[PDB]
Amino acid sequence: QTPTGIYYEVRGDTIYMINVTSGEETPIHLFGVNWFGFETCNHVVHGLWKRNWEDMLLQIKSLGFNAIRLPFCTESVKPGTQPIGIDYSKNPDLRGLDSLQIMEKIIKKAGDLGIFVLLDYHRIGCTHIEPLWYTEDFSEEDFINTWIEVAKRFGKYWNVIGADLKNEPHSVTSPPAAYTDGTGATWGMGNPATDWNLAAERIGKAILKVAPHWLIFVEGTQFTNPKTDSSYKWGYNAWWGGNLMAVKDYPVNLPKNKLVYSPHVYGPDVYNQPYFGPAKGFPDNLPDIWYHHFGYVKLELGYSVVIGEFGGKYGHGGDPRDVIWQNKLVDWMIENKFCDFFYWSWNPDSGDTGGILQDDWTTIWEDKYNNLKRLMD
């Protein structure tokens, strides 16, 4: 049942941590941030050219976060891959460590701070988010075998809560071709080769065999199937990893107590959606849009829903509407008890969103953080 003595499960729409020996159960909330870099060709979380890695973890904790989503790529979790771009004067205890060793060191230190870790298979290779969980040179079997290896190793760390199976399933063409051309993810189309709802079951089953105590986080797609997507006026305008409209009629076939749906959602800094125009009702139109794309998965169906990525520049060198957008989203999350989330990102080096840290990798954006802090109390 568990190699750590700790077992994670969902009961209703809440995540619990169970100590299997004592029988003690505690509901947990995830007040999270994404710290990315292991999925990039740096092969290590970013910022270690400017900061000490432990200081970073301490700072994250000091802000009241208790969870980190950690993107990785295939090579970052294999022995022998060397990190690039670390200032070893500020990080002397990382000298001579490969990427995998640094990942273990970070997760252990997070655990010491009571910080939960969600592992996110973010890129197959270190360059770009593929739309599917396989490529020409890298098969679904390869992808699954990588998850198995990761689950066996990291399943031993008590604070690792589970697996975000694939970052942002999406499409690289427009409907109608996106549903049939084999280049992008679908949901409820019926073809198990492209249907993310079916692949997630296959990948999830394999992971739970070796890490039965983990949770399986399943993101949305961009498009699902034409019947579902056409059933709503903004059906073709969901984010990558953000379309959960097909969950109702095409649920992922995995145990209810292990499954967490994990939509991504973004504001005008990422894309100028038509619905961000005051002409189309911005921002009072937003709750119904969020509700349709993903919110109903919790509010109507009662699944656990954890927002896996959301963020924006909050008016710092971006679209000023982003301030209104992030405020409205936080208001809505509070009102509707979406208490579990991972903000994108801790890193400032995200082109279209910036992060919680400013470009100096040291000082935070006080206003952006103050808004976020409302979710943590």
Residue numbers in the entry: 34 to 410
What do the authors report?
The hyperthermophilic endocellulase, EGPh (glycosyl hydrolase family 5) from Pyrococcus horikoshii possesses 4 cysteine residues forming 2 disulfide bonds, as identified by structural analysis. The crystal structure of hyperthermophilic beta-1,4 endocellulases (EGPh, glycosyl hydrolase family 5, T opt = 100 °C) from the archaeon Pyrococcus horikoshii, that was isolated from an oceanic hydrothermal volcanic vent, has been determined. The disulfide bonding of C106 and C159 forms at the end of the loop associated with the substrate-binding active site cleft.
The crystal structural analysis of EGPh mutants revealed that a new disulfide bond at the position of P74 is formed in P74C and P74C/C106S. No significant change in the enzymatic activity at 80 °C was observed between the mutants and the wild type (data not shown), suggesting that the region involving the disulfide bond did not significantly influence substrate-binding or catalysis. The wild type enzyme was thermally unfolded at 103.4 °C. The melting temperature of the 3 mutants was approximately 101.5 °C. These results indicate that the alternative new disulfide-bonding pattern involved in the position of P74 did not contribute to its hyperthermostability.
